[PDB]
Structure 1
Amino acid sequence: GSTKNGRDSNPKMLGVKVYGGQTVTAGNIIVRQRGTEFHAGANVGMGRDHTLFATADGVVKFEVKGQFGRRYVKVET
């Protein structure tokens, strides 16, 4: 006979692009994510596809905050 499987989708290259302690410029993308695994803090904007980008020049920092305990990424000038 034959098999009904044998299909897959092309890769999407998701994940973190700039790690904590690094330097960024305004407009640099920091996180590529399907959902909001990370949220935006100061000087970080969110795109329509949930991408996180930097709106200011500085140093990236990750943190855990809030009652929900969700993770935030921000830029320090």
Structure 2
Amino acid sequence: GSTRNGRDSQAKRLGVKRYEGQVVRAGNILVRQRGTRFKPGKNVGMGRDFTLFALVDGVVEFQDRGRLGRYVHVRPL
């Protein structure tokens, strides 16, 4: 007897790192994802790894535009 599986990868801490109505600064992360489960709304960018990050010192906000996807914004102050 013996096994041939027993291997795995280190969980990557995926998910959202700042929620709607939550106060962030320029450069913080807003979503950690694989693919574009969310999209860069306003004042928000996205990096080579679909990582969303604020672009100004604002206030987070989400938006479900149906077929168009779920976007995360940053309305300033």
Matching of residues 65-76 of structure 1 within 5 Å: 65=65, 68-76=67-75
Identity %, equivalent residues: 66
Deviation, structure 1 residue 42: 0.9
Corresponding position: 1:23 with 2:23: yes
Structure (1/2) with the larger strand percentage: 1
The amino acid across from 1:75 in the alignment is: V
Deviation, structure 1 residue 5: 1.3
**Partner Cα separation in structure 2 for residue 71 and residue 36 of structure 1:** 9
Q: Which runs of 4+ in 1 moved over 3 A?
A: none
Corresponding position: 1:5 with 2:10: no
Deviation, structure 1 residue 69: 3.8
